[PDB]
Design a protein around this ligand. Structure first.
Ligand code: SF4
Length: 462
């Protein structure tokens, strides 16, 4: 429907305006003589927030050129045109709205962060790996940097205690990922077993280099995971060496996943399999080779197919994305595609840059109500990419340490209740992952809207 699609490049706004005007007039919401003018303002707001989801309400108001009073009425009328919310939620910016902003809002998570309440974190990352075998360009691993082997026993006992804390109501709250490589922890399978015994359904994010048949034999609890998402660093040995520094690494990862596919089919295991792939500038044609890679694994699986792929950026991208989507429908129809925030709007030809938070726009309280990460030492990191040993300036972002005497619940509560705040210095912004930046940008928007006297309407859509 025209009003449902109006945020995409080249959309028919005349048809969107007519459709919205008809809804307003048929609902008695505005006099028919003025329905067209108001419908144009509402379509403009849908186009705006369907492309730029963090826009302060006052900036959008100024761009419409209307009264604070007229804007209040517009926001109320917007809520009575369901097609326009669809236009925002499925627009170029739709990955922001449907995958992150609106699920967290509806779970009260941004409300808790905004009010700075000492709630248990919504998403808890456990970083259980003491090392990694790869040597990616800018990671601490291109030093000796690693956790001491002696930390494993106490660390794994600490992780179990954190698993015992996870409140009910969200089986996916906890995941295993890292700074460093989780499969490097000999006890990861028993942590996964512990988690599944406590009703959790966690995913592991891994390079899968050590996901061999021998590892599964020593760590049978990995089979009980909800999912294994392999970070794909290339599609042949050459591209893998460029990225990881390791030779023959693609064939090892592919060899591991081929065998894993056959074992998953033999055990009839409910575990899911996904991949994360980064499209490099000018190399978007490689997405077709990613389909070939996945189809091959599907052949190893005797019917059991790869479940999902996550594709993000950082020759014409929109064409390569289109060709990629066609190739998936052709060769791997059951494959679910999840697009990162930028590539999701590039799908329809919309100009899109990823967020680039700088120290001036970092929130000194961070957002532990939304996410924290815990490493082998029990240190609770406030941003996903600060949790690396020997990483310069990163320990400033430790909210506290989980020990036998202090729980994760207590670390977070104590840090929130004392008004804990970390002043941002240059470079701290690289401790944030894409999720941290979306959460920061959303909370900056919510704080701005509330400060401008739009408390209930804060964030435009919720
Ligand atoms: S970025 Fe990840 S895979 Fe690469 S060296 Fe660091 S921990 Fe290992």
């Amino acid at each position: 429907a025209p009003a449902e699609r109006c945020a995409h490049p080249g959309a028919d706004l005349g048809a969107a305006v007519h459709a919205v005007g008809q809804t307003l007039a048929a609902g008695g919401l505005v006099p028919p003589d003025e329905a067209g003018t108001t419908a144009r303002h509402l379509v403009r707001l849908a186009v705006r927030y369907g492309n730029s989801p963090f826009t302060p309400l006052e900036e959008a108001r100024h761009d419409l050129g209307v009264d604070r009073d007229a804007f209040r009425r517009l926001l109320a009328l917007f809520g009575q045109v369901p097609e326009l919310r669809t236009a925002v939620e499925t627009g170029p910016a739709g990955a922001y709205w449907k995958n992150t902003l609106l699920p967290l809002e509806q779970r009260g998570v941004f409300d808790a962060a905004l009010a700075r309440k000492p709630v248990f974190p919504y998403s808890v990352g456990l970083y259980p790996g003491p090392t990694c075998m790869f040597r990616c360009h800018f990671c601490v691993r291109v030093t000796g940097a690693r956790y001491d082997p002696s930390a494993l026993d106490a660390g794994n006992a600490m992780f179990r205690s954190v698993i015992d804390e996870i409140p009910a109501g969200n089986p996916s709250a906890m995941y295993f990922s890292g700074g460093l490589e989780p499969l490097t922890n000999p006890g990861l399978g028993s942590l996964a077993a512990h988690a599944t015994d406590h009703g959790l359904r966690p995913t592991v994010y891994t390079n899968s280099f050590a996901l061999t048949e021998r590892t599964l034999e020593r760590q049978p609890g990995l089979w009980g995971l909800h999912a294994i998402r392999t970070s794909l660093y290339g599609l042949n040995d050459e591209e893998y060496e460029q990225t990881t520094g390791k030779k023959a690494a693609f064939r090892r990862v592919r060899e591991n996943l081929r065998r894993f596919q056959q074992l998953r089919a033999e055990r009839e295991s409910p575990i899911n399999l996904g991949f994360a792939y980064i499209v490099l500038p000018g190399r978007a044609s490689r997405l077709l080779d990613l389909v070939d890679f996945i189809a091959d694994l599907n052949d190893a699986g005797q019917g059991r197919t790869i479940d999902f792929v996550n594709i993000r950026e950082d020759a014409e991208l929109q064409e390569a994305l289109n060709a990629f989507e066609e190739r998936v429908r052709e060769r791997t129809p059951g494959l679910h595609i999840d697009y990162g925030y930028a590539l999701n709007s590039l799908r329809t030809g919309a100009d899109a840059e990823l967020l680039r938070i700088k120290p001036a726009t970092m929130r000194p309280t961070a957002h532990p109500q939304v996410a924290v990460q815990v490493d082998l030492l029990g240190d609770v990191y406030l941003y996903r990419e600060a949790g690396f040993p020997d990483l310069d300036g990163a320990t400033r972002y430790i909210a506290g340490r989980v020990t036998p005497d202090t729980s994760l619940t207590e670390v977070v509560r104590d840090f929130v209740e004392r008004g804990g705040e970390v002043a941002a210095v240059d470079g701290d912004e690289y401790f944030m992952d894409g999720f941290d930046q979306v959460v920061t940008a959303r909370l900056n928007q919510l704080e701005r809207d509330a400060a401008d006297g739009w408390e209930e309407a804060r964030g435009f859509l919720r």
